[PDB]
Structure 1
Amino acid sequence: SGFRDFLLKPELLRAIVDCGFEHPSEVQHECIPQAILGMDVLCQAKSGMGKTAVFVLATLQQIEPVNGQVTVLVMCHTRELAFQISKEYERFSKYMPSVKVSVFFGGLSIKKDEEVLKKNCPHVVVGTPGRILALVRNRSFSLKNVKHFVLDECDKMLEQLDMRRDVQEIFRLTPHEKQCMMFSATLSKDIRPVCRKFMQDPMEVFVDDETKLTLHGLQQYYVKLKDSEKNRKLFDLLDVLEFNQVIIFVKSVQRCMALAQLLVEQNFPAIAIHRGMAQEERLSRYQQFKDFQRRILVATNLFGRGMDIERVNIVFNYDMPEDSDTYLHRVARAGRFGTKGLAITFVSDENDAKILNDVQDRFEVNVAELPEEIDI
C-alpha cells in the first residue's frame, strides 16, 4: 500500500509483497523518495529499521541492465554482510529476471572470481573493497559504467585508513556522474565529514541522533545479578510486568533458544529469534510476536536484520550489551509511541558495570539500581 506511493515498478512491489512487508519503515519514508530520484544519501540506522531495503529497492528501481556493464557497485566491510546484501538483491529482484547480481568478498580465488565475472557479466556487483580493487586492477571488470555507488558499514570502512584508501581508489575509477549512498548502523560525528566529501548535497538521516535525545525520557534500571540468579529475578519481574510486549536480549544463539524454552516451560508466551535463522523463519516468528500470541521475544543482536522491528513496551539486557552503541540500539525500542518505556539491564560482573558507566557517561542519563518493593 504505502510502497505503491513510492511509485516503484510493479515487479518490485510484487517482490516486497512476497517478502511479507506490509508498509514502509520510517527510514524508508525518509530516504526512498529521494533515493529513487538519484539523490545522494547519508543514512545511519540501527539493525531492523529497513535500511538495507532503501538502497536495494532504490538501485533496482533505477537500474537499466546492459550486459557487460556493472552499473551498481555495493561494498561493505565484512564478508558476511556482503553475502547477505547479495541475497537481499536476489529477494527483491525475484520478478526482475534481467538483473544479474554477483558477490566478491574473497570466498573464491581471484582467478575463479575472474571466471565468474566473464561468464555471468553481473549488472550489480557486491563485495569487499580489497577484492573489488584487486579485480579491477587485474582488469577482470571495469568500473567505467558505475551509476550507483553504495557503501554499507561505511564508518568501519572509512575509519580504517587502509580501507579508506582502497575505497577512494575504487571511487576514482567510477564516473564522476553517479549516485552515492552510504549506510551504517553507527556514524560518529567525526566520520560524517569524511562521508560527505564523496557526495553532492546529500540527504542525511541519523536515527541515533534522535534516540540520544529521547533517551532521557526512558526509565532505565539495572539489577545486580550473577548468572545463576538471572532467571528467578526475570521470572519474578515478568509476573509483575504482565500485558506488556517485551524483548529480552541475550549474548548468544544457544542462550536465546534455551531462555525462550525455559520461559515457555514456565508458562510465559515467549518465542526465540536469533540472527542465524533464515529470513522466512525470522519473519514468521516475528509476526507472532508483533501481531498474535507471543508477548516475549528472546533475541540476539541482529535478530531483525532485513526486517522492520516495531517498538515494544519493555527491553531487558539479560546479558550485558558489548558496548554503549549496542546498549543504545537495544533499548531504543523500549516505549511504544506516546507511551512510557522501561529498560532493565542485568549487571553480573565488573566489566558489565564498566559498560553501564560508559553508557551513562556518553548519553548523559541515569540507570538506577532497581528497587526492591512494589513497582508503583
Structure 2
Amino acid sequence: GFRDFLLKPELLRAIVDCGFEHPSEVQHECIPQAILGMDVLCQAKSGMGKTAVFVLATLQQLEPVTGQVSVLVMCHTRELAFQISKEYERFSKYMPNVKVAVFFGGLSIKKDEEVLKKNCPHIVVGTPGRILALARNKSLNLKHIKHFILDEADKMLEQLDMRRDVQEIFRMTPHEKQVMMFSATLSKEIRPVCRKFMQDPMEIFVDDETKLTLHGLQQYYVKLKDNEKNRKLFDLLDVLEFNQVVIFVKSVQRCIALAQLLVEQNFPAIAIHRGMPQEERLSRYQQFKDFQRRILVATNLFGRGMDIERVNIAFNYDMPEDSDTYLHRVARAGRFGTKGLAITFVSDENDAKILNDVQDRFEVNISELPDEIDISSYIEQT
C-alpha cells in the first residue's frame, strides 16, 4: 500500500502496525509531492487519512537534531492538536529518538516551558495562541523550523485575530522551509495568506468523499422506554437472523455496559467507544472482521461508512443526535452488498422529532417494526 510512497522502512512497519495498507485518495495525491519538500495547498475533508499525509511526509524528511524543534504543526482546536500528536507518536513507533510534544491552553504554560528547556522535542504541535506565547517569551525557539504545517486553515485564518498571530509565528521561522496547508474549505482568506506563506504550491483539491445513501435498505423503528430497550433488543437478537450486528449507543458508559451485558449473555461482542486510544479503537474495529455471529457495540466508528459485508443489522439503540449521524451509522460501502436492515429505538417524544426529521432529509419512510421480516430483504445471498 504505502510501500509505493517510498517511505523509510521504520515508517512502513509502524503503518502496518496501525492496521491499514490501503492509502486514501488525498494521500495518493499529496504524499508524493509532500515527501519531496514541495509546498502544498490541499483542500480535502477531515479524516480520510488527511493528517497522516503531513505526519508521514514530515517524519520521512525529518533530520532529527537534539534540542532543536524542526517541525511546527498548528491547528484551530486543541482536541485535533492532541490527536495529531498521538498520531506522530504512533507512526514514530520505530523511530526511537524522534520526539513530539503538544501545547495548548488549559494547561499551565509553565509546564510547556519546562519541557522546552529540559527536553525540547523535534516536533511541536499546538494551537496558535499557546504557540505564539511560548515563542514571544523565547521558551520556544522557532529558528530551526524546516516544516511549517497548518491544519484546518480555513478555520484558523477566518478571524483576523488568529490569522495575525499565525503570521507573527510564521515570520519567526526561517524563510526557507516547507509549508503545507490543509483545509476542508477553501475560503478567500487562505488565498491571500498563502501568497504570503507559500511560494508556488502544488494545489491539490481532493473531493468530499461523495457518499450517503439509504437506497435498497430496510428501515424500521420501535417506540419504547429505556427500561425496555435491553429486553426488546435481546428479543430482537433472538428472532432476527444475522452474520454480524452493529449497535449504536449515545455514551461510553452505555457502550461499555451494553457490550459487557451482551457478552455475559453469551452474545460475543466487542466495544468501541470514543473513550479509548485511536490504536485501541483501530485494533478492535479491525478485529471485528471475524466470526459467524459477532456484535459490535459502538458510539460511532469511522466516517468511511459500514464496510463489513457480513454486517446485516445496524441498531440505533440510542437515537442518533442528528439526522446526519443516521446516514453515517447506516449505509453500505465496502466490496458488494447493498441490502441491510436498520432498526431505531424511540423512547422520547424528542427522538421522534429527530426520526421524523430523517424521513424528510433523505425522503424515505421508516415504518414501525413488523412481526415478520423476510430474511432475504436485508441479507442479500442467504
TM-score by length of 2: 0.75
CA distance in 2, matches of 1:225, 1:196: 58
CA-to-aligned-CA distance 1:156-183 (integer Å, 9 cap, x gap): 6456776455445445555666555555
* Structure 1 pair 203–102 and aligned structure 2 pair: CA distance change class (3 A): same
CA distance in 1, matches of 2:93, 2:17: 9
SS at match of 1:343: strand
* Structure 1 pair 109–288 and aligned structure 2 pair: CA distance change class (3 A): closer
The answer to whether the Cα contact below 8 Å between 1:67 and 1:123 also exists between their aligned partners in 2 is: yes
C-alpha displacement of 1:204: 8.2
The answer to whether the Cα contact below 8 Å between 1:282 and 1:304 also exists between their aligned partners in 2 is: no
User: Pairwise CA RMSD of aligned residues?
Assistant: 4.5
CA-to-aligned-CA distance 1:35-77 (integer Å, 9 cap, x gap): 4344566778888754443332221112223455433222234
The answer to whether the Cα contact below 8 Å between 2:43 and 2:182 also exists between their aligned partners in 1 is: yes
C-alpha displacement of 1:112: 3.5
SS at match of 2:288: helix
* Structure 1 pair 367–53 and aligned structure 2 pair: CA distance change class (3 A): farther
C-alpha displacement of 1:254: 1.6
* Structure 1 pair 102–64 and aligned structure 2 pair: CA distance change class (3 A): same
The answer to whether the Cα contact below 8 Å between 2:154 and 2:190 also exists between their aligned partners in 1 is: yes
2:106: which partner in 1?
Answer: 107
Moved more, 39-48 or 9-18: 39-48
Unmatched runs of 5 consecutive residues or more in structure 2:
375-382
The answer to whether the Cα contact below 8 Å between 1:311 and 1:335 also exists between their aligned partners in 2 is: no
The answer to whether the Cα contact below 8 Å between 1:315 and 1:333 also exists between their aligned partners in 2 is: no
Moved more, 90-99 or 123-132: 90-99
C-alpha displacement of 1:104: 1.0
CA distance in 2, matches of 1:188, 1:225: 46
CA-to-aligned-CA distance 1:329-359 (integer Å, 9 cap, x gap): 3335666545334443333324333444555
C-alpha displacement of 1:284: 4.6
CA distance in 1, matches of 2:340, 2:181: 31
CA distance in 1, matches of 2:182, 2:173: 19
The answer to whether the Cα contact below 8 Å between 1:335 and 1:342 also exists between their aligned partners in 2 is: no
Moved more, 128-137 or 180-189: 180-189
CA distance in 1, matches of 2:63, 2:183: 26
The answer to whether the Cα contact below 8 Å between 2:42 and 2:205 also exists between their aligned partners in 1 is: yes
SS at match of 1:313: strand
The answer to whether the Cα contact below 8 Å between 2:158 and 2:189 also exists between their aligned partners in 1 is: no
CA-to-aligned-CA distance 1:207-226 (integer Å, 9 cap, x gap): 99444454556554444333
CA distance in 1, matches of 2:306, 2:334: 19
C-alpha displacement of 1:269: 2.7
CA-to-aligned-CA distance 1:263-286 (integer Å, 9 cap, x gap): 233433321122323455445533
C-alpha displacement of 1:287: 3.7
2:245: which partner in 1?
Answer: 246
* Structure 1 pair 369–273 and aligned structure 2 pair: CA distance change class (3 A): same
The answer to whether the Cα contact below 8 Å between 2:217 and 2:342 also exists between their aligned partners in 1 is: yes
CA distance in 1, matches of 2:235, 2:44: 34
1:227: which partner in 2?
Answer: 226
CA distance in 2, matches of 1:241, 1:46: 37
C-alpha displacement of 1:154: 5.6
1:301: which partner in 2?
Answer: 300
* Structure 1 pair 256–59 and aligned structure 2 pair: CA distance change class (3 A): same
* Structure 1 pair 306–156 and aligned structure 2 pair: CA distance change class (3 A): farther
Unmatched runs of 5 consecutive residues or more in structure 1:
none
Identity %: 93
CA distance in 2, matches of 1:123, 1:374: 59
C-alpha displacement of 1:255: 0.8
Moved more, 175-184 or 287-296: 175-184
1:345: which partner in 2?
Answer: 344
C-alpha displacement of 1:81: 3.8
CA-to-aligned-CA distance 1:270-321 (integer Å, 9 cap, x gap): 2112232345544553343113466211012368999999995443222122
* Structure 1 pair 191–6 and aligned structure 2 pair: CA distance change class (3 A): same
CA-to-aligned-CA distance 1:54-110 (integer Å, 9 cap, x gap): 332221112223455433222234444433332221222232234321221235432
TM-score by length of 1: 0.76
The answer to whether the Cα contact below 8 Å between 1:35 and 1:58 also exists between their aligned partners in 2 is: yes
1:153: which partner in 2?
Answer: 152
CA distance in 2, matches of 1:311, 1:54: 31
* Structure 1 pair 235–51 and aligned structure 2 pair: CA distance change class (3 A): farther
* Structure 1 pair 21–289 and aligned structure 2 pair: CA distance change class (3 A): same
CA distance in 2, matches of 1:243, 1:369: 20
The answer to whether the Cα contact below 8 Å between 2:212 and 2:331 also exists between their aligned partners in 1 is: no
C-alpha displacement of 1:4: 1.5
CA-to-aligned-CA distance 1:208-245 (integer Å, 9 cap, x gap): 94444545565544443332232233234434543333
The answer to whether the Cα contact below 8 Å between 1:68 and 1:122 also exists between their aligned partners in 2 is: yes
CA distance in 1, matches of 2:344, 2:185: 22
